[PDB]
Point group: C3
Chain length 601, copies 3
Amino acid sequence: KAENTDANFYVCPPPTGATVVQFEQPRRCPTRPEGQNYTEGIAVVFKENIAPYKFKATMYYKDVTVSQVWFGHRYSQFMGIFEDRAPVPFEEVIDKINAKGVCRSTAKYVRNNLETTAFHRDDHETDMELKPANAATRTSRGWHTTDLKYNPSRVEAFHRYGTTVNCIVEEVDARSVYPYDEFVLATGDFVYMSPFYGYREGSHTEHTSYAADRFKQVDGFYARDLTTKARATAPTTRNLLTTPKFTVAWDWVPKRPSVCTMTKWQEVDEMLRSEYGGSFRFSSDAISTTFTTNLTEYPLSRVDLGDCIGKDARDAMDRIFARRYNATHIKVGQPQYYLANGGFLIAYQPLLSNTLAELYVREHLREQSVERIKTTSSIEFPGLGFTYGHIQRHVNDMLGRVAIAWCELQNHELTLWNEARKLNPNAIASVTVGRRVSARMLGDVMAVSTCVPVAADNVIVQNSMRISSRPGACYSRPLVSFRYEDQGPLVEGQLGENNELRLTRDAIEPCTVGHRRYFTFGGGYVYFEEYAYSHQLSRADITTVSTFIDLNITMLEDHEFVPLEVYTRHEIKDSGLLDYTEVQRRNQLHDLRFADIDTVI
Amino acid sequence: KAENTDANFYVCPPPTGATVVQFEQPRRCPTRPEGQNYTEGIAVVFKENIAPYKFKATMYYKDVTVSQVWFGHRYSQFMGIFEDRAPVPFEEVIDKINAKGVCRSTAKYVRNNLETTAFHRDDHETDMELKPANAATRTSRGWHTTDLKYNPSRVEAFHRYGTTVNCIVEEVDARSVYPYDEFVLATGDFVYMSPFYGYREGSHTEHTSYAADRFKQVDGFYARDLTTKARATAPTTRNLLTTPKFTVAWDWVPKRPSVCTMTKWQEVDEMLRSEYGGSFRFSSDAISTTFTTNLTEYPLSRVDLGDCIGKDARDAMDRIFARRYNATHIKVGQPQYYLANGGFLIAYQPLLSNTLAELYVREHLREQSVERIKTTSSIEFPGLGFTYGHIQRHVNDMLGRVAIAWCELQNHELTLWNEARKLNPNAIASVTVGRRVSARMLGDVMAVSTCVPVAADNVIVQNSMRISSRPGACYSRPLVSFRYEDQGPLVEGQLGENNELRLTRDAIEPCTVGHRRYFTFGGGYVYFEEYAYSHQLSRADITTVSTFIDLNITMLEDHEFVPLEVYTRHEIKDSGLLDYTEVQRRNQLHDLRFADIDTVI
Amino acid sequence: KAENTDANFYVCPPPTGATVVQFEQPRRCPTRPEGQNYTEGIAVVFKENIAPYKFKATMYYKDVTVSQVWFGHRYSQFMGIFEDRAPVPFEEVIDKINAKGVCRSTAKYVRNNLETTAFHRDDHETDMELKPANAATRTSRGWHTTDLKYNPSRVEAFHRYGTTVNCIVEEVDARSVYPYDEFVLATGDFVYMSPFYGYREGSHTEHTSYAADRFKQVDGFYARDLTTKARATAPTTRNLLTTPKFTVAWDWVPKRPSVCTMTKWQEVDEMLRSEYGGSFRFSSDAISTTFTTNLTEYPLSRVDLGDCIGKDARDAMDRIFARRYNATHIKVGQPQYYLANGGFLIAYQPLLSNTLAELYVREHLREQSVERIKTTSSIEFPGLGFTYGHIQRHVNDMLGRVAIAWCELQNHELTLWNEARKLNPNAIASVTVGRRVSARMLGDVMAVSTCVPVAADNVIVQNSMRISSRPGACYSRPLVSFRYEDQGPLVEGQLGENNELRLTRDAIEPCTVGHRRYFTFGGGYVYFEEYAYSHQLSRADITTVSTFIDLNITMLEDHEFVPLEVYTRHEIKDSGLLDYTEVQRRNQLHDLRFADIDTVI
Ligand SMILES: *[C@@H]1O[C@H](CO)[C@@H](O[C@@H]2O[C@H](CO)[C@@H](O)[C@H](O)[C@H]2NC(C)=O)[C@H](O)[C@H]1NC(C)=O
Ligand SMILES: *[C@@H]1O[C@H](CO)[C@@H](O[C@@H]2O[C@H](CO)[C@@H](O)[C@H](O)[C@H]2NC(C)=O)[C@H](O)[C@H]1NC(C)=O
Ligand SMILES: *[C@@H]1O[C@H](CO)[C@@H](O[C@@H]2O[C@H](CO)[C@@H](O)[C@H](O)[C@H]2NC(C)=O)[C@H](O)[C@H]1NC(C)=O
Ligand SMILES: *[C@@H]1O[C@H](CO)[C@@H](O)[C@H](O)[C@H]1NC(C)=O
Ligand SMILES: *[C@@H]1O[C@H](CO)[C@@H](O)[C@H](O)[C@H]1NC(C)=O
Ligand SMILES: *[C@@H]1O[C@H](CO)[C@@H](O)[C@H](O)[C@H]1NC(C)=O
Ligand SMILES: OC[C@@H](O)[C@@H](O)CO
Ligand SMILES: OC[C@@H](O)[C@@H](O)CO
Ligand SMILES: OC[C@@H](O)[C@@H](O)CO
Ligand SMILES: [Cl-]
Ligand SMILES: [Cl-]
Ligand SMILES: [Cl-]
């Protein structure tokens, strides 16, 4: 019997030829795709402009205080203070200040539908000098005639008034937003006129909310710098609006050049555009993002106040070609404007290498074939897509190759399986149908028929290989006997390879000197020597070597991506030093907290 | 000797059988995983609502100015102006304005704990018409009785007063935020009462900061549209609060339906939920994001003011099933509410295809088994995860297959290595232990023993293949001699394949007509013809063909992802036209820059 | 002829040896890279601090109203109201309030360069108690002496004045921002002095905009809590500034400890740093991001007001090592400060496992070898990179292995192709040059020459395999005849494998009992039996089995990533309850809409 039992035994009566099989012919090998095709190009990306129009301006006004004081024993108490900003007449600004840097000590102005007027100190008019405002960090420039408050001189038990008239001139930045038909200052003072209003060009159509005479425009003007007392070298066109409280002056410039609904966001040297099922796809190596567009360009006409765009994109695409392509490529058609999801305007100039110059004609043809645009705040998804495509591309290429390389090999080896099939039809067959079988070749095809199992506790090997029947020669393979069923009548046979029990004992070789062999037998072997038995063996007790070329794949583990913000939207909010809402709220609770708004006395 | 030296020589005395080896049996092939399992479902995603409650309102008030003017030679100067908004009595609004669109030319009100009163022009009471405010772009509607300022008539050297009383009515939008117990206007005016205060329902418990009589509620009210002079068709419940400065009117509505702590963010047709180690995972193809939850639903109870959620999610999930599933699937249980990291509430309806209807019973069971929620600002990580999983999944699948396909092949080919082993035990062996060796088969296993190296500058081939010893036949393989060591005694042998030096010269074939052969010999060959020598050869000088199926892997290069923002947080800030902080800062520096706050006179 | 035509016929006259070929020797197998190398380490990430300095403060002031009323028949009308906040003298706050929680019913102060003064009710001075402000939700604490407005008693036709003097004390939060040289309150009131001004330490150099006597500092002060009337247990250094309108008090603390330009953003247990072409790369498993730095550390010196950084990072890195490494590793050098793109300061402590302790000496050496930093708002790209690298790494590893495993196999199998080549030189050859050819072995190389095509409509098989010429034996392969060209003279031959037409009919086997075979013949077979014809066959009509190990690669589909925001930048804006710009705009339009700013009367 068999020490080792980790195995099975079969009997393989040659197939008649009732069952035949053929080998699958070489399959059609997959073909590498002609390719996903790109278009070299330069690009300039445009985000909706969210910056206000910014420009310096200068105000001139006069703060007028009128106080009344009661005079008594020991003390003086204010009975009332009336403050006010008075706007400066056009002529004064010119003929005084920009003339001689001085101001009247009298304010004459309209207030509440009466022409009021005010004398500093109530003394008669005096031109006073303009001396700078007291020093303040992070302020533009101011100037002021006085810095004291004139109160009525003390006469007992007799109330009276003091007019003081401080002439104030400030330089202030001025901001405004689309559609640029009014602007504001740094004082909080609104001014309800376009910044580009005027007489010159079409400006007159620009918006105004004021009476016609509150605006002047000294064409050809020269500024006298209050501090330096230097006149202006080059003349401006100077705008001057007199609102109920002040006069603001500034230089006029044309609208169209001065503003734009969009901003040049990013400049891309190499911007590769593809078309992915009728949608366009520009991706940058640098910015690592990838945008998606329609196959039609976008009409700048439809863009209100988009002058800069053309001017800006062009200026940069040309600057780029010089630094990097003066030898290198060819401009296929004029620049083209696309609008990627997320509302990012895209200026693209399709290119074409130098060496391969011949194709201008080809693509040029293809390269030839209002409102407010909003831009998302996040470049996230363009990044994702970029990242996903590149990895997708690569992976899908390589594995694709592995597919074919594989197939090429499957078809290759058939040439061996053929010849191998002729050598051991038994084994080759059984490895091909994943079960043990008997087999035979009928010319070009394989006759096969099944193989019968035999209980491993039913197999018996005979001790010698020497043949009493005919001496000199020996059975080349050990002798055995076995039963199919337990109580079944014993059968006689010769051992084969892989526990194949051959019924006929014909496998014979001449007795050679010092013969010593091992044979597959159950879960292990059995050893022989000089044609006589010795012992069995564990498969383990013999040096094992492998035909298997190793490769171990490991999985790429799951990862978890907990959401994480750099700054929480409130953190940002809280960077607001003063909170307007918080203050008005607080301010407007005062009476409710500290006095009585109900009780009539 | 040998022209070509890029090689080595060995001598392979047949192994006795001291060393034996076996072939590694077929390994256990990896098994494809039963799979990661999804659950079809529809979904509606909810971000924390950050919008204030918005609603129209109408104010009615009266600006009262009282000026005093001094009369002198040549001029008039204001000695003081006192402005004020006076709130309108409940009855006036009703019995005048909403009655007949007119207003008294007198204001009677409480101010500073005295019932002051004011006569426009000081002439006695007059009802005056309500004429629209002068035109202003981007304003709601106003109306006003007068538009002039009445100043006291000129009498010389005699001061006096003018009461003017402008009746003003405005429609204004009104905003408020959680917890909705006070609201504000577009005038900046705070009103410290819930918007949902009233007598009806439980509203009375809503917050108030005012005396009880400053509120009225004309149940069943009809608005008379000041401009059109058309009465209101359907009645409202109308709220009217009289703050110290004005009366604001609006229609009352119930709270619960009127507001929600959350907003319906996104509607997802196909939302696939998985469970990944006891955590849930819903991912959308469309939005390309993937969220992570606990395995337990979220109790809407815990959500304060979350009425809409249920109402909204339900409304859409049902609308969806119609457009896309009226034939297609089956609702497993009622909708379920999950809360993904990032605080995104998720309404999910687990589904199940039509064809496979049989499983309701199975999952339904499983589908059965306060506070303020904050939502992050960025959908970044849900996107990342989404992107990572999908690529992970795919890759890990394919390579997984490559692993098995490979293994299947390693086990396959052993069937050839077997039969091949019997044919050239020498070569097969040496390729299996990665070093040259001699070998032999002892039945089912391989007897092996080593092979000895011989200096390439020590090998000598004999010129003829014809045998003086026995003529007619020829050595089938060229004759050689060689020494092991330099000064070692020469040895005689016959050449084999791959520079194998056979000690016995027994390899013999009959001299055939016009014989011509090449033999492996050193870094190249040596050519023969008619059994006599001719010359050697470079391996290179002969047409080479390959058995190698090609595949070339390329690496996917590193990429760098420079951080890039669309808009810098300051860019956003700067989109604030007026900056409150900048202005108050500037405003509150005035005195410090332009006057003196120290010097007592 | 041949029923099946899906095939071709060839004739293969043995090559003379004019054309010979060799097999490509084993190629050099790729070598796995020694590896990308990491450095274990702990980390703490720092975002630019955007929070203002926050600290409690307490103001003390006095609102002074002076009203005049006209007395007439039936009524009283205000002729004017003058309101004002008056600042409290240093002594009062101390010697009254913090002493005895009471206040004078008189205000004495400087206003407009006159020392005005005010008597509550005009009755003489009275100390009055400080009673809390009326209750208001979400306010800090106030207190006030009175809550009524005193108006002049009614005498007919005689105007007069009422001075009322409400003493108010508030606790208010106070905020300020870099460079911390002035701060603000919750009242909107600016205070133009550093919060850290004082006499102690170097503070005196801190900024001031006020006269020197408006500041006091009671070193060693004890607060009396107005409500509880409990004195303060521990003494403060108390700052008190008297601005023109109020006095604000607060405790002084040193600057350096009290503020920091940066904030501890994130704490990373395992932070792996690599160097990628001379740029550093720290990536976290947890936060799933990966940052990029230069190979040089960053000098904290260059960081203005960065005291906390050192203090904070150190404190946490040490806390971490305890929880997780008290046994585990070794601190290679002191902490190191790097600044990753996006301006994220990085505190890193390079570590080294315990078991492998021997390398301190090695890396320690390497670990040894002002301004305002801005931090981007988005952690996007660090995430991308993180995600991309990890997938890149993995993929590039595995496929890399597949490359080698493959190559190892290509070189392996040559050992079979060799022996196989000797068995069927015909077939092996033709599969190696991808076209049918005749072949032969000249020792160690392959003699080859071409094979000739023959029209499939030109091949004829002869019916018996029995040989009239010599009986007993049979042609082992069916007999045929064929022409090369149509009208060409017929040729005689024997069939071979794969439609090989052998010109000589020498393939012969003894007639065996009950012979039955199939032969490859055109697009199918032809069957034989007992050496006589029977019929042909379709390839399809026979059981086919495959030698091909299957593997199917599928592509990972394109995905589209539509841009998607959680909250649109305006949605955020609109979360601003009151909009300052909207209000001032609206407020400053008033006159334009409701009165006349032109018409002089
Ligand atoms: C690109 O062109 C397509 C049609 O040619 C536009 O597609 C529509 O886009 C709007 C958004 O503005 C969607 O709401 C519609 O449902 C889309 N229609 C369809 C059927 O797809 C698209 O507007 C163009 N893209 C841009 C950025 O302008
Ligand atoms: C999901 O359930 C788990 C517990 O079942 C919760 O886990 C905790 O989440 C908080 C954040 O709110 C962490 O600070 C705790 O450390 C977590 N505990 C543990 C041990 O994991 C979690 O709160 C639930 N998720 C949501 C979104 O509610
Ligand atoms: C890292 O060091 C490099 C040089 O060693 C710096 O590179 C420059 O960075 C600035 C941005 O501040 C770029 O505008 C320059 O073009 C860069 N020079 C070059 C040639 O690369 C870099 O500033 C350092 N990084 C940090 C975050 O400080
Ligand atoms: C042209 O290209 C070369 C390339 O090095 C460069 O030196 C030069 O700046 C470029 N000049 C032009 C024409 O812009
Ligand atoms: C039902 O589904 C079909 C599918 O085409 C569609 O035409 C129809 O709108 C759907 N109707 C319902 C019941 O919603
Ligand atoms: C030391 O490490 C062990 C590990 O379990 C832990 O129990 C303990 O908290 C750590 N103690 C120290 C020294 O921090
Ligand atoms: O001093 C604070 C005061 O000006 C505000 O509460 C008015 O609303
Ligand atoms: O004109 C500017 C003036 O109103 C402010 O500076 C007051 O603070
Ligand atoms: O009542 C609104 C009024 O205070 C503002 O329009 C002033 O600008
Ligand atoms: Cl891409
Ligand atoms: Cl996923
Ligand atoms: Cl990484």
